[PDB]
Design an enzyme around this catalytic site. Structure first.
Site, short mmCIF file in Angstrom:
data_model
loop_
_atom_site.label_atom_id
_atom_site.label_comp_id
_atom_site.label_asym_id
_atom_site.label_seq_id
_atom_site.Cartn_x
_atom_site.Cartn_y
_atom_site.Cartn_z
N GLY A 18 -3.63 -1.32 19.58
CA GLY A 18 -3.21 -0.34 20.58
C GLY A 18 -4.42 0.03 21.42
CG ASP A 120 5.02 4.33 18.45
OD1 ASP A 120 5.72 3.87 19.38
OD2 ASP A 120 3.94 3.81 18.08
N1 LIG Z 1 -0.74 0.80 18.64
C1 LIG Z 1 -1.04 0.05 17.82
C2 LIG Z 1 -1.40 -0.87 16.78
C3 LIG Z 1 -2.71 -0.65 16.04
C4 LIG Z 1 -1.40 -0.31 15.35
C5 LIG Z 1 -0.90 -1.26 14.31
O1 LIG Z 1 -1.25 -2.44 14.29
N2 LIG Z 1 0.00 -0.76 13.39
C6 LIG Z 1 0.69 -1.63 12.49
C7 LIG Z 1 2.20 -1.84 12.64
C8 LIG Z 1 1.25 -2.99 12.89
C9 LIG Z 1 1.01 -3.93 11.73
N3 LIG Z 1 0.43 -3.08 10.66
C10 LIG Z 1 0.35 -3.54 9.37
N4 LIG Z 1 0.73 -4.85 9.20
C11 LIG Z 1 0.77 -5.30 7.90
N5 LIG Z 1 1.22 -6.59 7.64
C12 LIG Z 1 1.32 -7.58 8.61
C13 LIG Z 1 1.51 -8.97 8.28
N6 LIG Z 1 1.56 -9.72 9.41
N7 LIG Z 1 1.40 -8.84 10.44
C14 LIG Z 1 1.43 -9.30 11.83
C15 LIG Z 1 2.88 -9.41 12.37
O2 LIG Z 1 3.39 -8.16 12.73
C16 LIG Z 1 1.27 -7.52 10.00
N8 LIG Z 1 0.45 -4.57 6.76
C17 LIG Z 1 0.03 -3.31 6.99
C18 LIG Z 1 -0.07 -2.75 8.26
F1 LIG Z 1 -0.55 -1.52 8.39
C19 LIG Z 1 0.18 -1.69 11.06
#
Ligand SMILES: N#C[C@H]1C[C@@H]1C(=O)N[C@@]12C[C@@H]1CN(c1nc(Nc3cnn(CCO)c3)ncc1F)C2
Length: 275
Positions: A18, A120
């Site tokens: 972000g 959000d």
């Molecule tokens: N604004 C803004 C942006 C920075 C905020 C952000 O990235 N928040 C999040 C929701 C995204 C992903 N994320 C997380 N993603 C995952 N797993 C995972 C496995 N593949 N992928 C990529 C395919 O989606 C993600 N484990 C914990 C998390 F915490 C946390």
């Protein structure tokens, strides 16, 4: 609680970003897979302190697990990523989509009972653990509802998820628990369109508003929402599910179901399609 040491965190890949924050996959090797969220190099910093504090106090099977600190925020790694990333690639069935919808309502009902609004709620923030488990995975805009008030006073930011917002947020800058139901209705639409980009809320609403509109996107948005115009019924979305979506999109905030109301409804609607 747990104090992860930075020198032992081994970056694997990026998971999300972000305008103010980044989430990376790390391997915590002091000789486990963790999602670590960092703020980019005072108002966004104070909001960041509240973000960590908010997740520290949340425990629910449909809420990403807080894992400790390093400030950087260490969370569990949710293996199959966001439904936004997963859905365009995996033709998941209607039943599973509705189970996800129920699982989101449970985590949201829980979040709401803790006196927090999410602000959000989108498919990009819904993380897939396995084909039968979903978790709300980000709390960047989550705020506490002040005790003597039924909503939080938002303030406009260029990075507000306006295409997931009820008219009260866009017009009066008031975020109610009912404003997250609106977002949920938008997340439900996303899930039913399989997160197809040509069908997404920004694509679909910008088609309705147009792009020659100067500083007036939000204003043209609020007025079409006020004219009763809505995101269309997704291809192969049942009539009943579409009506539940529209009920989440009532212009009148009080006419929307709460998350508690949605749980038995989704439970029943999933059971129906699971057969
Ligand atoms: N604004 C803004 C942006 C920075 C905020 C952000 O990235 N928040 C999040 C929701 C995204 C992903 N994320 C997380 N993603 C995952 N797993 C995972 C496995 N593949 N992928 C990529 C395919 O989606 C993600 N484990 C914990 C998390 F915490 C946390």
């Amino acid at each position: 609680p747990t104090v992860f040491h930075k020198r032992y965190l081994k970056k694997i890949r990026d998971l999300g970003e972000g305008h103010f924050g980044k989430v990376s996959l790390y391997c915590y090797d002091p000789t486990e897979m963790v999602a670590v969220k960092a703020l980019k190099a005072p108002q966004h910093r104070s909001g960041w302190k509240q973000e960590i504090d908010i997740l520290r106090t949340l425990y629910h099977e449909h809420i990403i697990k807080y894992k400790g600190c390093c400030l950087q925020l260490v969370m569990e790694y949710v293996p199959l990523g966001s439904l936004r990333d997963y859905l365009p690639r995996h033709s998941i069935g209607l039943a599973q989509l509705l189970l996800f919808a129920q699982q989101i309502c449970e985590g949201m009902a829980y979040l709401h009972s803790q006196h927090y609004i999410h602000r959000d709620l989108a498919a990009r923030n819904v993380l897939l653990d396995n084909d039968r488990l979903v978790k709300i995975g980000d709390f960047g805009l989550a705020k506490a509802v002040p005790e003597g008030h039924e909503y939080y006073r938002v303030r406009e930011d260029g990075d507000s998820p306006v295409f997931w917002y009820a008219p009260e947020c866009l017009k009066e800058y008031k975020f109610y628990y009912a404003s997250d139901v609106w977002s949920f209705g938008v997340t439900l639409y996303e899930l039913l369109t399989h997160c197809d980009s040509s069908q997404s809320p920004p694509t679909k609403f910008l088609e309705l508003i147009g792009i020659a509109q100067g500083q007036m996107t939000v204003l043209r948005l609020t007025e079409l929402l006020e004219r009763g115009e809505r995101l269309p019924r997704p291809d192969k979305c049942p009539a009943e599910v579409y009506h539940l979506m529209k009920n989440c999109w009532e212009t009148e905030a009080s006419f929307r179901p709460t998350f508690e109301n949605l749980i038995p409804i989704l439970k029943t609607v999933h059971e129906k399609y699971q057969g």
